[PDB]
Design a binder for this molecule. Structure first.
Ligand code: HEM
Ligand code: HEM
Ligand SMILES: [C-]#N
Ligand SMILES: [C-]#N
Ligand SMILES: [Mg+2]
Lengths: 110, 110
């Protein structure tokens, strides 16, 4: 069975990458989720006028990802997550998010 | 301090992801490079035009990755690689590559 990766790509107001990444430091239950293997939270290195933060999650299967999305644990972790565009998103530097999905065809870990 | 991720993004002819991914199964020395940690080879799902395959490499530092690019093993692994546009490359499904670079702000592995 092929592993699976999801990417949540966040476009952020310039300068806000570091404060946004810090939100991911403390766990909110992902460690309890069936099929979850790893998470990376990254800042893209470039000269763009917005920041880009990506959340990569590695899963034993797409199904395990799908089940996480429907889970109480996911819902709870995201209850206070808002976008700049939301009516109550005044304090949010998160301009947009876009989800990308991938088959992991090969993995090596030293 | 912070880990580092490099991405090589391969823009491929439609349908060629799987044959391309198979070329990455066999290690060619990257695992001997100081600071190398992990490699993922991904296929982007639900693409309708060109196929897309990404090679993600995870490093102890940007310096480690920089050293890999200068290495003999990098050279040896890539010596027979051709883009479709190369004089002898017409049969290659590889249309282009683009490199992206990331600071890893947070990582969790179950
Ligand atoms: C594909 C759907 C999504 C996945 C797989 C995902 C994954 C995750 C994970 C694994 C965590 C850590 C939670 C934990 O430690 O238990 C998290 C938290 C977080 N996510 Fe997502 N997420 C998704 C949707 C979104 C969306 C749409 C946004 C909008 C910006 C977002 C922004 C955030 C933020 C800001 C945090 C930190 C939580 C906080 O501030 O309390 N996520 N997410
Ligand atoms: C010049 C454009 C590049 C193209 C078209 C390309 C394509 C390829 C191909 C087709 C292979 C498998 C070779 C084979 O069939 O034996 C390969 C190997 C590999 N490439 Fe690239 N590549 C390029 C540059 C890069 C860059 C810049 C990186 C890192 C950012 C990278 C990371 C890797 C890794 C880790 C391997 C496996 C090497 C090993 O196991 O030692 N490649 N590349
Ligand atoms: C959420 N990423
Ligand atoms: C080469 N990727
Ligand atoms: Mg296909």
């Amino acid at each position: 069975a092929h592993m699976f990766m999801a990417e949540n790509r966040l476009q952020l107001q310039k300068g806000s990458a570091e404060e946004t990444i810090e939100r991911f430091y403390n766990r909110q239950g992902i460690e309890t989720i069936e099929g979850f293997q790893q998470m990376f939270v990254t800042k893209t290195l470039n000269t763009e006028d917005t920041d880009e933060v990506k959340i990569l999650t590695i899963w034993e299967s797409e199904d395990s990802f799908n089940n996480y999305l429907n889970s109480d644990v996911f819902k709870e972790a995201h209850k206070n997550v808002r976008l700049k565009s939301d009516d109550d998103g005044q304090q949010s530097p998160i301009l947009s998010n876009k989800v990308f999905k991938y088959d992991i065809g090969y993995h090596y870990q030293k």
